[PDB]
């Protein structure tokens, strides 16, 4: 089983920076992807970032250029570096870890407020 | 020895069952024993079949819910979505080829109207009661007043349970972080069920031996069994050769306009390893290395697609399972109509994804398929007699497609 | 038109089904079609009915467990505890009025002993097996040695499942923080089931069209249906007029000794909005504003009670559902004894609590009610042909009761 | 009085039921009532029976999963493992002694072949369908062509559910931290079921009164029932005396080679407290103090083993339950073959572990046993007539075996 | 779905003050009431404080006058201000959030010790 | 219901010391044992330490003499004192609380890295 530990988040002034961390601990047979989704109040969740085995990454349209997802390959942890934050970035951020066609793990979610 | 202890014990069990059945039949026989001893003689095999049938329900439901919930669009991207479609299409083609070859060449050879059969299929695909579906299925008979009347008869609605588990998993995928508790619940239930499955597999050799002994005692012409078994092996190997040398290379050429046999020559050593070890997991590192160095596939494609295909894309297993289902249907003198063929293909396409990249990984999925089409499961002990051969041909076909898919995606990356 | 698109599609499907049935009856008919083509002709509607029947069990059980577990005494206080009883009593009165009017006026008009019926009802309220109750219920027949012999017969014990879910939810409420895992489990199962329900509703127009076409093909004189359907509408509207102009004002006067029609004149504009939009959620803000300003209800009463009543207290929906159940029973030539009437009232009260504050929110609850008393669900396609009209009167009656309950509680506060 | 209000209410209900039955029998009997009035008269007891049968399934499954999953090797060590083995062995011996004495003395006295019976037992131990086992069990009949044919017939497969719950709990124990969610889920379901059980027990006196009245009305000779009840008490007390004065001291001497009666003299006051209070929990502190001081048992053994044995080790409850099962079988003119005796022993050994250390703790487990062997549960109202006596003698046997267990383990610590 | 985050518990001296906070994050259709219950060792759980939509509040009999429940209407958070704490106030405190006749959310609980 | 709260763990240099704590909160009828297991990457669960009612203790073979389990009988808490930590002591540590033949509670696990 996998346990997801989230760190980072909180209140940040516009134009500030954050560094979210999602660490997976335990045993998974084949971790295929790891990433972040976000849900703003009243809207559906949207992809923020994802990094997959082999090194490929994808980003949401709104956060391209500013957000950067990276992986500490030693401990199966991912880092979301958020720069030039806007007030529209205020949301609950959920990290997930996916073994495709086997199972998915979702985080509890961390609030990020930009104001 | 200790690495393949279970497979060796399965073969030893089938040999001992043959010897015990021949000894019982030659010295006395079924008539000498009578029903009072025949019933108790075959009982351990019945107990094994009973345990398998009991474990089928939680395994199918939980694993399919988990597999459907995990299809996150961002985790796959365009490349993983296209790879998954390729995997599904090629598994369906392998299943169809296996069924067709086992129908044309008949290794096993020695009521309801068509519209009602299709309507019964649609009714079972969408059951009216989830609890009833665990032990009953909809069937239509006719009353002469021929008015068709249908009701629920005994027999677990495996197809309806599969469809419900997939749809529920898609709903959990749509809920996302909100469906987390249910996703964990079903994943952990699946893990507990797999522990039970391992214990049942440890018991399996005794049940298999007594199943084989009972079948040998009940049968008169044993050499005919060996003839049919040889024809079944020939059907399986021919299907594997056709899929691996004609169908998949043709698909690769149609999507790439390059030589598929040069690509296959780039992966000869991993294919030899797949044959020798009969394991897709043991083939994966060398396969990734050869596909990257010899065939020029980028690491961000190989190191993503090949590990997924090593588990989910099993064309050889699907072809073998469909051939085995048709072969057992022909041995049992059952008639396979279009509804049964559709059920075989659908359950095989799901079970090939659910099969494991280990030796004899597709036997339990075959039991699931036979239960899905109400076919005798005790005949599995016959095909288990030759799996050490057939499975080795499956692995070569299981790891080949993953390679040709990767080279099929890299080309697109090279063209965009 | 993008909003309420599903309602438009249901009405369009009803029209298309009428046209299809008339065309088939004219150019040929059921006799020309034969049973072979007739059974396949109505099949999509049967598939819709099977899907509706399938989602009933998880939906009812999970929603009722959650509803019962959430009745925290501190969260309600004395005011909410009295408001919930007022809601329950008025919903029961609306259901009884609807049943009585439909029995007296006979909109749809063109065995077991009494004690045994009551005893079977009691046996089904307390089922002896939870798993069996999902697909069977107890019934008593007679053997002439006339001694009654009873057994479990086919048909989901909806009433027993409702009672078990409520009692289990009360146990979870007693456990409190200790029952948190089970509360989350059943809540998330309910959410996944609701996703499935929303998927079913998108298929519903096709099934409804074919259900209507099949009924029209079977019917001899179609013009008679519109004579009964119209009468059905009358029985609904009259009921809404009696509950809303006589019963509720009488209760308000008896508890307040004040003019109820001055209160209604204070809330006329939200009532007009409720009729126009056919939605309680849309009229809730206006209702709170008018009840606070025009009627002088304190904000700590309105802003607490009216949002709960907007979802929970639905007298119009209950009256409509009971009238529809009796109307369908009369159309189907079925007989309603006291046991079936009691089941109708109980399931209707629970479903009116469970009905949504959206246009046509009570249709699925009506399907549950009809399934609870073994009535034909395919007749629902008749009542949703005029739901655009009945549902607006339902919404008016649904919001008026909330307003009058808030006024009654405000008077009690002012007197203390 | 308020502490034992429920026991007093059960005895009062038995007395009132006797009075009602005698009054009705004198005033015309069942003939004057007629079948309809008799059924309505006995219905409240049938409702209680239905409630008990309904809560049986979740209680057994969840409690056994939790009990199996908690058998952590490190939490037990060598001492707890040996103590658990000792508890199991002595409970099996007490159950066997009770069955043997009830068969030899015949307190209640006034088709299928052996091999097929054993095969049916094996098939029910390993059910082929978990959902079906909740309400059906496998049985073999014979058809004359006599060849045995078997199928699933009505009647919940309690033995199969027990075995599955144990094996699933053992799988969860192997998963450890990974089975945490399932362990919590089944624990909380068991707690909610226990809340329902307490509510049902509060209803129970009303049902018991009518069960007793309906039994008294049917019988002609009521005086014979009292003699049979007196013989049942004698059988129970004789079993308790033999187990507590001969079998357990013999085991202690065989493993220890010193006087067991000196050890029992060391604990006379806790035994007197166990008789007086009829509670093992109220005996535990004084028992620990007396064992440690008089018998010289180290605190690390007493303060670990004795609290566990106060709950899980109940030889008196098991002996009483087996005697009661055989007594009820003899009262109902049912025949107990070896399969039913095996089922009685297994269910009783599980249930005495599951029984509570409170007055009348074993009655519900007795109902579970009777349902497991398809015996009439309504006869329990007779046993409840004398439990206030028998249960007290059970408590003395329940707390003695723990003490002699601890004193046994201490000896090994002294030897090593 | 609602996630409840509790803060502000621990050890305090008699006559001291504490400020518990229960924050609900996520989506709920209609929050009707939010509050605190407490369970002392060996006793049944008892109501501490409720605040409901519309502003009405209720308190347990023991804590009336000393405890005050308040709402941050901006971020859907409740605060329990405990003043003049006494040894009898030592208990596990659970916050809950209720949608009446729909569902209830219970917190994990915070230990409060007064000694 | 029992809730297990773990504290301690993290990164420690070889030869360093750590003090894990597992505290049980809530109601359990009869706590029979409390202890720690550990799982290293790639290996199976192994017993670290256990303390039972009555005072008896047991330890894993590799950790005997260095680790010491103790109980604060006041608040039903156990402490694992790890001394002379070695790189082989790097694992996820799970505490558990057991009522024998009734139920078991497992902790979420704390990572311990000795490097
Ligand atoms: C003869 C053969 C074709 C029988 C096998 C039938 C299945 C292949 C079909 C029957 C019902 C189908 C399902 C019906 C409904 C849906 C929901 C649908 O979900 C959505 O539209 C939204 C998805 C999301 O938002 O998560 C996705 C396809 C799916 C799972 C379908 C997948 C394919 C299923 C399982
Ligand atoms: C077809 C019609 C006539 C059926 C009507 C039956 C229901 C109105 C009854 C049947 C069983 C009753 C339940 C039986 C037991 C209980 C437990 C009872 O809980 C307590 O006594 C303690 C509550 C707590 O501490 O949480 C509350 C009422 C309730 C839910 C009852 C509510 C009303 C129920 C559902
Ligand atoms: C009615 C009478 C005649 C027989 C009753 C049958 C039971 C006593 C048997 C039937 C199946 C048995 C179980 C079959 C499988 C296992 C798994 C086995 O687990 C392991 O081998 C690994 C244990 C772990 O790693 O946790 C432990 C024994 C157990 C629970 C067995 C315990 C005893 C059971 C319940
Ligand atoms: Na494939
Ligand atoms: Na593969
Ligand atoms: Na596979
Ligand atoms: Na109402
Ligand atoms: Na409603
Ligand atoms: Na309303
Ligand atoms: Na014992
Ligand atoms: Na005991
Ligand atoms: Na016990």
**Gaps in chain A following residue numbers (C to N > 2.5 A):** none
Distance between CA atoms of B244 and B397, rounded to whole angstroms?
A: 6
Q: Is D288 in the pocket of ligand 3 (CB under 6 A)?
A: no
Binding-site residue set of B for Na(+): 309, 311, 313, 398, 402
- Hey, what domains does chain D have and what are their CATH numbers? 1-414 (1.10.3860.10)
**C284 neighbors C301 (Cβ within 8 angstroms):** no
Distance between CA atoms of A75 and A78, rounded to whole angstroms?
A: 9
Place of tokens 């790439």: B256
E7 touches chain A (CB under 8 A): no
B188 touches chain C (CB under 8 A): no
F11 touches chain D (CB under 8 A): no
Q: How many CB atoms lie within 10 A of CB B199?
A: 16
Phi, psi (degrees; rounded to nearest 5) at C42: -95, 5
- Cα diameter, chain B: 75
Q: Write out E3-59 in H/E/C secondary structure.
A: EEEEECCEEECCCCCEEEEEEEEECCCCCCEEEEEEECCCCCCEEEEEEECCCCEEE
Q: Looking at beta carbons, which residues of chain F come within 8 Å of E111?
A: 25
Distance between CA atoms of C318 and C352, rounded to whole angstroms?
A: 5
Q: Write out chain F in H/E/C secondary structure.
A: CEEEEEECCEEECCCCCEEEEEEEEECCCCCCEEEEEEECCCCCCEEEEEEECCCCEEECCCCCCCEEEEEECCCCEEEEEECCCCHHHCEEEEEEEEECCCEEEECCCEEEEEC
Place of tokens 């209702």: C287
Contact C175 D191 (CB under 8 A): yes
Phi, psi (degrees; rounded to nearest 5) at B246: -120, -50
Domain count, chain A: 1
Task: Answer whether A touches C (≥3 Cβ pairs < 8 Å).
Answer: no
**A90 neighbors A22 (Cβ within 8 angstroms):** no
Q: What is the distance of C-alpha B175 from the center of its chain?
A: 30
Between helix B280-293 and helix B299-312 the angle, nearest 10°, is 160
* Rg for chain E, CA atoms, rounded: 14
Q: Is F16 exposed, middle or buried (0-12, 13-18, 19+ CB in 10 A)?
A: middle
Assigned token pair, C339: 């046991």
Q: What are the C-alpha distances in Å from C325 to residues C291, C319, C336?
A: 34, 10, 10
Three-state secondary structure call for residue C109? coil
In terms of Cα–Cα distance, which of C288, C313, C318 is closest to C300?
C288
* Residues, chain D: 416
- What pairs with residue C171 in β-bridges? none
Distance between CA atoms of D67 and F103, rounded to whole angstroms?
A: 6
**D413 neighbors D301 (Cβ within 8 angstroms):** yes
C340 touches chain D (CB under 8 A): no
Three-state secondary structure call for residue A62? coil
* Rg for chain A, CA atoms, rounded: 14
Interface test with D, best of F6, F40, F57, F102 (most D CBs within 10 A): F102
**E61 neighbors E95 (Cβ within 8 angstroms):** no
Distance between CA atoms of C360 and C188, rounded to whole angstroms?
A: 24
Distance between CA atoms of C365 and D24, rounded to whole angstroms?
A: 47
Distance between CA atoms of D254 and D25, rounded to whole angstroms?
A: 57
DSSP 8-class letter at E87: G
**A91 neighbors A40 (Cβ within 8 angstroms):** yes
In terms of Cα–Cα distance, which of B85, F72, D47, B244 is closest to C124?
D47
- Cα diameter, chain F: 41
Distance between CA atoms of D395 and D361, rounded to whole angstroms?
A: 10
Kindly provide the b/e burial profile for residues D63-98, where b requires at least 16 CB atoms within 10 angstroms of the residue's own CB. bbbbbbbbbbebbbbebbebbbebbeebbbbbbbbb
Q: Write out chain B in H/E/C secondary structure.
A: CCCCHHHHHHHHHHHHHHHHHHHHHHCCCHHHHCHHHHHHHCHHHHHHHHHHHHHHHHHHHHHHHHHHHCCCHHHHHHHHHHHHHHHHHHHHHHHHHHHHHHHHCCCCCCCCCHHHHHHHHHHHHCCCCHHHHCCEEEEEEEECCCEEEEEEEECCCHHHHHHHHHHHHHHHHHHHHHHHHHHHHHHHHHHHHHHHHHHHHHHHHHHHHHHHHHHHHHCCCHHHHHHHHHHHHHHHHHHHHHHHHHHHHHHHHHHHCCCHHHHHHCCHHHHHHHHHHCCHHHHHHHHHHHHHHCCCCCHHHHHHHHHHHHHHCCHHHHHHHHHHHHHHHHHCCCCCCHHHHHHHHHHHHHHHHHCCCCCCCCHHHHHHHHHHCCCCCCCHHHHCCCHHHHHHHHHHHHHHHHHHHHHHHHHHHHHC
- What pairs with residue F79 in β-bridges? F21, F70
E57: region left, alpha or beta (phi > 0 left; psi from -120 to 50 alpha): beta
Question: Could you tell me where the DSSP H helices lie in C257-386?
Answer: 260-266, 268-277, 280-293, 299-312, 315-331, 338-354, 363-372, 380-383
Q: Is residue A113 part of a domain?
A: no
Q: Looking at beta carbons, which residues of chain D come within 8 Å of F100?
A: 70-72, 75-76, 80, 84, 308, 312
Assigned token pair, E102: 């729909």
Distance between CA atoms of B296 and B403, rounded to whole angstroms?
A: 12
| Cα dihedral F27→F31→F35→F39 (10° resolution) | -70
Distance between CA atoms of A108 and D61, rounded to whole angstroms?
A: 31
F77: containing domain: 2-110
**D244 neighbors D357 (Cβ within 8 angstroms):** no
**A33 neighbors B72 (Cβ within 8 angstroms):** yes
Distance between CA atoms of D156 and B401, rounded to whole angstroms?
A: 49
Q: What are the C-alpha distances in Å from D33 to residues D24, D28, D40, D45?
A: 9, 8, 10, 17
Question: Could you tell me where the DSSP H helices lie in D332-386?
Answer: 338-354, 363-372, 380-383
| Cα dihedral C39→C43→C49→C53 (10° resolution) | 80
Distance between CA atoms of B234 and C139, rounded to whole angstroms?
A: 58
**B290 neighbors B267 (Cβ within 8 angstroms):** yes
- CA pseudo-torsion sign C207, C208, C209, C212: positive
In terms of Cα–Cα distance, which of A66, A32, A63 is closest to A47?
A63
Distance between CA atoms of C228 and C222, rounded to whole angstroms?
A: 11
* Residues, chain E: 115
Kindly provide the b/e burial profile for residues B312-337, where b requires at least 16 CB atoms within 10 angstroms of the residue's own CB. bbbbbbbbbbbbbbbbbbbbeeeebe
Contact B311 A30 (CB under 8 A): yes
Q: What is the distance of C-alpha B34 from the center of its chain?
A: 37
- What pairs with residue C149 in β-bridges? C141
Q: Is B170 in the pocket of ligand 1 (CB under 6 A)?
A: yes
Q: What are the C-alpha distances in Å from C1 to residues B175, C4, C201, D132, F56?
A: 27, 6, 17, 49, 75
Distance between CA atoms of B2 and B392, rounded to whole angstroms?
A: 19
**B409 neighbors B82 (Cβ within 8 angstroms):** yes
Place of tokens 């079609």: C33
Place of tokens 């059952």: B334
The angle subtended at Cα A29 by Cα F88 and Cα F108, nearest 5°, is: 60
| Cα dihedral C8→C12→C13→C14 (10° resolution) | 110
D216: region left, alpha or beta (phi > 0 left; psi from -120 to 50 alpha): alpha
CB half-sphere exposure, B325, CA atoms < 13 A: 37
Assigned token pair, D344: 């009685």
| Concatenated DSSP letters of D171-202 | HHHHHGGGGHHHHHHHHHHHHHHHHHHHHHHH
Interface test with C, best of B124, B129, B169 (most C CBs within 10 A): B129
Distance between CA atoms of E7 and D32, rounded to whole angstroms?
A: 71
Q: Which residues contact C384 (CB under 8 A, 6 or more apart)?
A: C10, C11, C14, C208, C360, C363
In terms of Cα–Cα distance, which of C357, C279, C378 is closest to C50?
C378
Distance between CA atoms of A114 and D73, rounded to whole angstroms?
A: 52
B271: region left, alpha or beta (phi > 0 left; psi from -120 to 50 alpha): alpha
Q: Is residue A92 part of a domain?
A: yes
Three-state secondary structure call for residue A23? strand
Distance between CA atoms of D397 and D239, rounded to whole angstroms?
A: 10
In terms of Cα–Cα distance, which of F114, F40, F37, F17 is closest to F78?
F37
Q: How many CB atoms lie within 10 A of CB B388?
A: 16
Task: Tell me whether strands A10-12 and A110-114 are parallel, antiparallel or unpaired.
Answer: parallel
Q: What are the C-alpha distances in Å from C406 to residues A38, B57, B344, C349?
A: 40, 51, 62, 20
Q: How many CB atoms lie within 10 A of CB B78?
A: 11
Q: Write out C352-384 in H/E/C secondary structure.
A: HHHCCCCCCCCHHHHHHHHHHCCCCCCCHHHHC
The angle subtended at Cα B30 by Cα B25 and Cα B33, nearest 5°, is: 110
- Write out the H or E segment, with its range, that includes residue C67: helix C43-69
Q: Which residues contact D310 (CB under 8 A, 6 or more apart)?
A: D280, D281, D283, D284, D287, D357, D398, D399, D402
Residues 63-92 of A with CB under 8 A from E: 92
Distance between CA atoms of C74 and B82, rounded to whole angstroms?
A: 54
**E34 neighbors E71 (Cβ within 8 angstroms):** yes
Three-state secondary structure call for residue C129? coil
DSSP 8-class letter at E89: G
Q: How close A94 gets to chain B, by Cα (Å)?
A: 7
Q: Is residue A50 part of a domain?
A: yes
Kindly provide the b/e burial profile for residues C330-346, where b requires at least 16 CB atoms within 10 angstroms of the residue's own CB. bbeeeebeebbbbbbbb
* Rg for chain B, CA atoms, rounded: 22
Distance between CA atoms of B69 and C36, rounded to whole angstroms?
A: 40
**E12 neighbors E114 (Cβ within 8 angstroms):** yes
Q: How far is the CA of C316 from the centre of ligand 11 (A)?
A: 60
Distance between CA atoms of A112 and A91, rounded to whole angstroms?
A: 5
**D60 neighbors D157 (Cβ within 8 angstroms):** no
DSSP 8-class letter at D336: -
| Concatenated DSSP letters of C147-198 | EEEEEEEES--HHHHHHHHHHHHHHHHHHGGGGHHHHHHHHHHHHHHHHHHH
Q: How many CB atoms lie within 10 A of CB B141?
A: 14
Q: Write out C6-34 in H/E/C secondary structure.
A: HHHHHHHHHHHHHHHHHHHHHCCCHHHHH
Assigned token pair, A23: 């660490």
Q: Is residue A115 part of a domain?
A: no
The angle subtended at Cα B55 by Cα B50 and Cα B58, nearest 5°, is: 150
Q: Is D125 in the pocket of ligand 3 (CB under 6 A)?
A: yes
Q: How close D401 gets to chain F, by Cα (Å)?
A: 18
- Write out the H or E segment, with its range, that includes residue D141: strand D136-143
Q: How close E84 gets to chain C, by Cα (Å)?
A: 23
In terms of Cα–Cα distance, which of B161, B152, B153 is closest to B134?
B161
Between helix C180-218 and helix D180-218 the angle, nearest 10°, is 70
Place of tokens 């080949």: B400
Q: Is E73 exposed, middle or buried (0-12, 13-18, 19+ CB in 10 A)?
A: exposed
In terms of Cα–Cα distance, which of C55, C90, C139 is closest to C365?
C55
Q: What are the C-alpha distances in Å from E49 to residues C175, C351, D412, E62, E80?
A: 19, 32, 57, 11, 8
Distance between CA atoms of D2 and C207, rounded to whole angstroms?
A: 62
Three-state secondary structure call for residue A98? strand
**Gaps in chain D following residue numbers (C to N > 2.5 A):** 110, 145
Q: What is the CATH number of the domain that holds F66?
A: 2.60.40.10
């Amino acid at each position: 089983q996998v346990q997801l530990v989230e760190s980072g988040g909180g209140l940040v002034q516009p134009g500030g920076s954050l560094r979210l961390s999602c660490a997976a601990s335990g045993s998974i047979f084949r971790l295929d992807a790891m990433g972040w989704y976000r849900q703003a109040p009243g809207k559906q969740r949207e992809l923020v970032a994802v990094i997959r085995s082999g090194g490929s990454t994808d980003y949401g349209d709104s956060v391209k250029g500013r957000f950067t997802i990276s992986r500490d390959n030693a401990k199966n942890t991912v880092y979301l570096q958020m720069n030039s934050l806007k007030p529209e970035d205020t949301a609950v951020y959920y990290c997930n870890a996916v073994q495709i066609l086997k199972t998915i793990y979702w985080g509890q979610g961390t609030q990020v407020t930009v104001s | 020895l200790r690495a393949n202890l279970l497979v060796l014990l399965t073969v030893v069990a089938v040999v001992a069952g043959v010897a015990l059945g021949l000894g019982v039949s030659g010295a006395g026989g079924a008539l000498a024993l009578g029903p009072e001893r025949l019933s108790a003689f075959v009982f351990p095999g019945e107990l094994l079949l009973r345990l398998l049938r009991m474990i089928i329900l939680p395994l199918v439901v939980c694993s399919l819910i988990g597999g459907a919930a995990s299809l996150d669009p961002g985790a796959l991207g365009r490349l993983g979505a296209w790879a998954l479609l390729f995997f599904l299409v090629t598994t369906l083609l392998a299943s169809a080829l296996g069924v067709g070859l086992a129908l044309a060449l008949q290794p096993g050879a020695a009521s309801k109207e068509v519209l009602d059969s299709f309507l019964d299929l649609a009714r079972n695909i969408f059951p009216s009661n989830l609890v009833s579906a665990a032990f009953r299925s909809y069937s239509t008979t006719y009353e002469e007043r021929k008015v068709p009347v249908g009701q629920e008869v005994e027999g677990m609605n495996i197809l309806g349970l599969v469809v419900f588990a997939i749809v529920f998993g898609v709903a959990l995928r749509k809920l996302g972080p909100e469906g987390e508790l249910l996703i964990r619940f079903f994943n952990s239930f699946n893990e507990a069920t797999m522990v039970l499955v391992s214990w049942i597999m440890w018991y399996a050799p005794v049940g298999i031996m007594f199943l084989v002994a009972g079948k040998i005692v009940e049968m008169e012409d044993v050499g005919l069994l060996f003839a049919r078994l040889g024809k079944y092996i020939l059907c399986c190997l021919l299907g594997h050769a056709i899929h691996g040398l004609l169908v998949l290379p043709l698909i690769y050429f149609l999507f790439t306009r390059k030589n598929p046999y040069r690509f296959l020559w780039g992966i000869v050593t991993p294919l030899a390893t797949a044959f020798g070890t009969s394991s897709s997991s043991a083939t994966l590192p060398l396969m990734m290395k050869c596909v990257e160095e010899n065939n020029g596939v980028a690491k961000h494609i190989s190191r993503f697609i090949l590990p997924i295909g090593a588990t989910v894309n099993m064309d050889g297993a699907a072809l073998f399972q469909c051939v085995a289902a048709v072969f057992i249907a022909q041995l049992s003198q059952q008639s396979l109509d279009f509804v049964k063929i559709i059920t075989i293909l659908v359950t095989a396409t799901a079970s090939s994804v659910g099969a494991a990249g280990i030796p004899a990984g597709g036997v339990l999925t075959l039991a699931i398929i036979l239960e899905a089409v109400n076919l005798p499961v005790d005949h599995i002990s016959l095909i288990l007699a030759v799996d050490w051969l057939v499975d080795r041909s499956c692995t070569v076909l299981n790891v080949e497609g993953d390679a040709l898919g990767a080279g099929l995606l890299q080309n697109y990356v090279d063209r965009t």
